[PDB]
Design an enzyme around this catalytic site. Structure first.
Site, PDB file in Angstrom:
ATOM      1  N   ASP A  87      19.237 -12.802  -1.649  1.00 12.88           N
ATOM      2  CA  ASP A  87      19.703 -11.680  -2.457  1.00 12.88           C
ATOM      3  C   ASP A  87      18.563 -11.208  -3.356  1.00 12.88           C
ATOM      4  O   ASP A  87      18.163 -11.905  -4.289  1.00 12.88           O
ATOM      5  CB  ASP A  87      20.919 -12.101  -3.295  1.00 12.88           C
ATOM      6  CG  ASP A  87      21.547 -10.948  -4.072  1.00 12.88           C
ATOM      7  OD1 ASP A  87      20.921  -9.883  -4.250  1.00 12.88           O
ATOM      8  OD2 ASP A  87      22.697 -11.116  -4.528  1.00 12.88           O
ATOM      9  N   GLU A  90      21.315  -6.480  -6.279  1.00 11.45           N
ATOM     10  CA  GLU A  90      22.228  -5.347  -6.076  1.00 11.45           C
ATOM     11  C   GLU A  90      22.639  -5.148  -4.614  1.00 11.45           C
ATOM     12  O   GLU A  90      22.627  -4.030  -4.101  1.00 11.45           O
ATOM     13  CB  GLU A  90      21.618  -4.058  -6.632  1.00 11.45           C
ATOM     14  CG  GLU A  90      21.294  -4.114  -8.116  1.00 11.45           C
ATOM     15  CD  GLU A  90      21.039  -2.745  -8.700  1.00 11.45           C
ATOM     16  OE1 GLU A  90      21.672  -2.421  -9.719  1.00 11.45           O
ATOM     17  OE2 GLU A  90      20.219  -1.986  -8.139  1.00 11.45           O
ATOM     18  N   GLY A  91      23.000  -6.241  -3.955  1.00 10.85           N
ATOM     19  CA  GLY A  91      23.461  -6.201  -2.569  1.00 10.85           C
ATOM     20  C   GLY A  91      22.357  -5.881  -1.582  1.00 10.85           C
ATOM     21  O   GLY A  91      22.611  -5.268  -0.546  1.00 10.85           O
ATOM     22  N   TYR A 173      -9.600  22.451   0.873  1.00 13.70           N
ATOM     23  CA  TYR A 173     -10.756  21.834   1.534  1.00 13.70           C
ATOM     24  C   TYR A 173     -10.342  21.101   2.812  1.00 13.70           C
ATOM     25  O   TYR A 173      -9.220  20.602   2.920  1.00 13.70           O
ATOM     26  CB  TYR A 173     -11.493  20.871   0.581  1.00 13.70           C
ATOM     27  CG  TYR A 173     -10.619  19.764   0.023  1.00 13.70           C
ATOM     28  CD1 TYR A 173      -9.923  19.933  -1.176  1.00 13.70           C
ATOM     29  CD2 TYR A 173     -10.485  18.551   0.695  1.00 13.70           C
ATOM     30  CE1 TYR A 173      -9.115  18.924  -1.684  1.00 13.70           C
ATOM     31  CE2 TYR A 173      -9.679  17.538   0.200  1.00 13.70           C
ATOM     32  CZ  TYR A 173      -8.997  17.727  -0.989  1.00 13.70           C
ATOM     33  OH  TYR A 173      -8.200  16.716  -1.479  1.00 13.70           O
ATOM     34  N   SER A 186      -6.809   6.112  -5.536  1.00 14.23           N
ATOM     35  CA  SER A 186      -6.943   7.447  -6.120  1.00 14.23           C
ATOM     36  C   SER A 186      -7.992   8.291  -5.392  1.00 14.23           C
ATOM     37  O   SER A 186      -8.139   9.480  -5.670  1.00 14.23           O
ATOM     38  CB  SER A 186      -7.237   7.373  -7.624  1.00 14.23           C
ATOM     39  OG  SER A 186      -8.565   6.949  -7.885  1.00 14.23           O
ATOM     40  N   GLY A 187      -8.719   7.664  -4.466  1.00 12.98           N
ATOM     41  CA  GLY A 187      -9.630   8.382  -3.580  1.00 12.98           C
ATOM     42  C   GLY A 187     -11.111   8.224  -3.852  1.00 12.98           C
ATOM     43  O   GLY A 187     -11.908   9.032  -3.374  1.00 12.98           O
ATOM     44  N   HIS A 191     -19.803   6.398   0.252  1.00  9.20           N
ATOM     45  CA  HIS A 191     -19.864   7.194   1.482  1.00  9.20           C
ATOM     46  C   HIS A 191     -21.171   7.915   1.673  1.00  9.20           C
ATOM     47  O   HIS A 191     -21.950   8.069   0.740  1.00  9.20           O
ATOM     48  CB  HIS A 191     -18.728   8.212   1.501  1.00  9.20           C
ATOM     49  CG  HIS A 191     -18.882   9.292   0.458  1.00  9.20           C
ATOM     50  ND1 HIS A 191     -19.412  10.497   0.739  1.00  9.20           N
ATOM     51  CD2 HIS A 191     -18.615   9.286  -0.908  1.00  9.20           C
ATOM     52  CE1 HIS A 191     -19.452  11.241  -0.383  1.00  9.20           C
ATOM     53  NE2 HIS A 191     -18.962  10.501  -1.392  1.00  9.20           N
ATOM     54  N   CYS A 209     -16.660  10.201  -6.434  1.00  6.37           N
ATOM     55  CA  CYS A 209     -17.100   9.253  -5.417  1.00  6.37           C
ATOM     56  C   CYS A 209     -18.516   8.754  -5.668  1.00  6.37           C
ATOM     57  O   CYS A 209     -19.289   9.366  -6.412  1.00  6.37           O
ATOM     58  CB  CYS A 209     -16.982   9.872  -4.024  1.00  6.37           C
ATOM     59  SG  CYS A 209     -15.274  10.025  -3.469  1.00  6.37           S
ATOM     60  N   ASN A 211     -21.649   8.711  -4.103  1.00  8.01           N
ATOM     61  CA  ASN A 211     -22.541   9.287  -3.093  1.00  8.01           C
ATOM     62  C   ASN A 211     -23.723   8.365  -2.823  1.00  8.01           C
ATOM     63  O   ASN A 211     -24.434   7.989  -3.750  1.00  8.01           O
ATOM     64  CB  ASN A 211     -23.143  10.612  -3.605  1.00  8.01           C
ATOM     65  CG  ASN A 211     -22.183  11.795  -3.556  1.00  8.01           C
ATOM     66  OD1 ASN A 211     -22.616  12.936  -3.746  1.00  8.01           O
ATOM     67  ND2 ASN A 211     -20.903  11.550  -3.316  1.00  8.01           N
TER      68      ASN A 211
END
EC number: 2.3.2.-
Length: 263
Positions: A87, A90-91, A173, A186-187, A191, A209, A211
């Site tokens: 359980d 709440e079921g 974009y 959050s991205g 890269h 980001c 870079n």
């Protein structure tokens, strides 16, 4: 099966994976858990060498477990989610049991210092690689703090359409990116950024980001693994939210260990 009354657990890392020293155990349910304490009591985590750890919920469906400090390389982790017929509030009953076994690999910690704009990769405490980076502009800065390496992509499309923003529009974009290593939900990625090579190591130019050069981004992609760590220091940004998805280590231990099963 009723979504309100039966829920399936899913555990990560997957069975037999080798992960970095920042990897938490993640147990994700496909429905909201009303009784977090029941769920925690149903999960048994065994570590060798043994280490203390604790549960913390990132949202209504996902709980994380980790120790106070980064894992020790070579640690073996066994996770038994014994939720079948339990359980969960709440079921709502656990539909099945799930298990995983995984191990921690080499300690890999990459530090980006905004003072030097270098990302320095350390493997078991030894510097193995330095790479120039261009981080977020003063106006769109990269947040400081501890990031966990997540998914990687040889190639990825950042597409505004997914968020309902049309591609052909001021904020729209559809962007092609190579050798992309995800470090926040959050991205934030490390890269390939051929467009900012001359600025890397010198001036911040990005949307947040990290870079790096095509060659260095391929190197990063090839040499990191899920659960490895990126630390960002000295930026004009804030701190990465502890509940990002890959920001777990930004929550101080005393907050994490107290948990939020009743909060």
């Amino acid at each position: 099966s009723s979504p309100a009354h039966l829920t399936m657990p899913y555990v990560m890392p997957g069975d037999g994976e080798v992960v970095g020293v920042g990897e938490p155990v993640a147990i994700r349910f496909d429905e909201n858990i009303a009784d977090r304490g029941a769920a925690e009591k149903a999960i048994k985590i065994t570590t060798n060498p043994p280490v203390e750890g604790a549960f913390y919920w990132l949202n209504n469906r996902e709980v994380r477990w980790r120790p106070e400090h980064f894992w020790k390389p070579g640690t073996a982790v066994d996770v038994a989610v014994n939720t079948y017929g339990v359980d969960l509030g709440e079921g709502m009953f656990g539909e099945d049991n799930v298990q995983t076994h995984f191990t921690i690999g080499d300690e890999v910690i990459a530090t980006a210092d905004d003072n030097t704009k270098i990302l320095t990769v350390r493997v078991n405490g030894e510097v193995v690689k330095s790479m120039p980076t261009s981080m977020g502009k003063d106006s769109t800065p990269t947040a400081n703090g501890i990031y966990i390496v997540g998914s990687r992509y040889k190639h990825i499309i950042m597409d505004s359409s997914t968020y309902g923003v049309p591609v052909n529009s001021p904020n729209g974009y559809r962007t092609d990116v190579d050798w992309a290593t995800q470090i926040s939900y959050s991205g934030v990625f490390v890269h390939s950024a051929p467009w900012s090579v001359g600025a890397q190591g010198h001036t911040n130019t990005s949307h947040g980001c990290l870079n790096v050069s095509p060659s260095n981004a391929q190197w990063f992609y090839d040499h990191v693994k899920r659960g490895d760590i990126v630390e960002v220091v000295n930026t004009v940004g804030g701190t990465l939210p502890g509940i990002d998805g890959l920001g777990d280590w930004n929550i101080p231990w005393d907050q994490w260990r107290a948990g939020n099963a009743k909060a």
